[PDB]
Design an enzyme around this catalytic site. Structure first.
Site, PDB file in Angstrom:
ATOM      1  N   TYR A 196       0.849  -1.183   0.000  1.00  0.00           N
ATOM      2  CA  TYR A 196       0.000   0.000   0.000  1.00  0.00           C
ATOM      3  C   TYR A 196       0.891   1.241   0.000  1.00  0.00           C
ATOM      4  O   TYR A 196       2.103   1.112  -0.208  1.00  0.00           O
ATOM      5  CB  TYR A 196      -1.018  -0.080   1.134  1.00  0.00           C
ATOM      6  N   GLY A 241      -4.722 -13.841  12.066  1.00  0.00           N
ATOM      7  CA  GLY A 241      -5.773 -13.210  11.277  1.00  0.00           C
ATOM      8  C   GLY A 241      -6.913 -14.185  11.056  1.00  0.00           C
ATOM      9  O   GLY A 241      -7.951 -14.120  11.727  1.00  0.00           O
TER      10      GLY A 241
END
Ligand SMILES: Cc1cc2nc3c(=O)[nH]c(=O)nc-3n(C[C@H](O)[C@H](O)[C@H](O)COP(=O)(O)O)c2cc1C
Length: 350
Positions: free
Chosen positions: A178, A308
């Site tokens: 990102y 996660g």
């Protein structure tokens, strides 16, 4: 050597255990991009985690890359997040907001026709995630030098708004290809001004964003996320050990709360290099089991471990781990779908 179930102090904040909930984009914020009662219950029921890192949250319209992911730029969004932080704290948890700008990993459909922005006009490979029909990433617009303070100001206001929303802190999203990771790595950043070229110049933006967060929160309440392998969204660097080591040394000098590294252990892992360079709390992550995670703590390779996918399926993961109970399996089909199905309907042991 610490147990996963022993307390850990990050900055001045004590966590009940070292079982961390990894940041997970779930796309339940709806069309208004505003956190809501459903997200509140989802997070609250995972509050037995030592620390929750929230789903990636965009600091500005320009840094949006997916449908129904939340932001932290508006007052409406702040009020939304207040529901989440209140519910998490009532259940006994701690929660950090992940501050996010997708940079080139986006599409004009999310930017009202504008091009995504980036260090350099170089598109990532593959196709835009989730959006149907499948399409390649358009070539982004390279940020002009005098636009970069605006990005930092967007992150600063993001950090102000997180504080107003009642978070325990913020984690800067410097990973997964990102915006800040695009500036960091030399496959995506080919700039020849002060934000490109040398390792120092490439790490500059991340460190300016970290310093803006530190101005709002102090270092004790700021974490940073990195992904050294560069294995998501067409990342890659000529010398990861040099690039990430420099970043790790600089963050450690600032004495921030923690460094979160997404990097499955294995022959090419550079996490231990980063940990020694950082010197503070080091959270490892990716393909960990209970036992390999305890093994990491026992070997001095991490101070805490994040999961996660398992936290998606197992709201009471810490207690399931405690009791060696079977774990729910996560269903990929509902990772990004609408509503409570595959979100809050994964049962706790009870
Ligand atoms: C559905 C999904 C959404 C994710 N969203 C984020 C995110 O918003 N920000 C982030 O830094 N990582 C995100 N990740 C990566 C996780 O935080 C984690 O690093 C990764 O899943 C590996 O950990 P695990 O093996 O325990 O699942 C996401 C992963 C998945 C599967």
């Amino acid at each position: 050597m610490p147990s996963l179930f022993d307390p850990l102090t990050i900055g001045d904040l004590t966590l009940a255990n070292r079982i961390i909930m990894a940041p997970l984009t779930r796309a339940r914020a709806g069309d208004t991009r505003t956190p809501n009662a459903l997200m509140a219950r989802y997070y609250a029921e995972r509050a037995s985690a030592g620390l929750i890192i929230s789903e990636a949250t965009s600091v500005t319209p320009q840094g949006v890359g997916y449908a129904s992911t939340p932001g932290i730029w508006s007052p409406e969004q702040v009020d939304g997040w207040r529901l989440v932080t209140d519910a998490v704290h009532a259940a006994g948890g701690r929660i950090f907001l992940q501050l996010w700008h997708v940079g080139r990993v986006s599409d004009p459909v999310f930017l009202d026709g504008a091009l995504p922005v980036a260090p350099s006009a170089i598109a990532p490979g593959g196709h835009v995630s989730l959006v149907r029909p499948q399409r390649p990433y358009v070539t982004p617009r390279a940020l002009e030098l005098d636009e970069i303070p605006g990005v930092v100001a967007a992150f600063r206001r993001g950090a102000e708004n997180a504080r107003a929303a009642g978070f325990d802190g913020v984690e800067v999203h410097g990973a997964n290809g990102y915006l800040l990771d695009q500036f960091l790595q030399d496959s995506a950043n080919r700039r020849t001004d002060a934000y490109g070229g040398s390792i120092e110049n490439r790490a500059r933006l991340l460190l300016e964003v970290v310093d803006a967060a530190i101005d709002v929160w102090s270092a004790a309440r700021v974490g940073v996320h990195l992904a050294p392998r560069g294995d998501a969204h067409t990342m890659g660097d000529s010398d990861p050990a040099a690039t990430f080591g420099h970043v790790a040394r600089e963050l450690g000098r600032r004495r921030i709360a923690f460094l979160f590294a997404r990097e499955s252990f294995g022959g090419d892992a550079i996490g231990q290099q980063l940990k020694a360079a950082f010197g503070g709390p080091f959270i490892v992550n990716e393909n960990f089991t209970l036992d390999s995670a305890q093994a990491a703590l026992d070997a001095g390779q991490a101070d805490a471990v994040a999961w996660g996918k398992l936290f998606i399926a197992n709201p009471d993961l810490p207690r399931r781990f405690k009791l060696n109970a079977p774990l729910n399996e996560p269903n990929a089909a509902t990772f990004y779908a609408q509503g409570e199905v595959g979100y809050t309907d994964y049962p706790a042991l009870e």
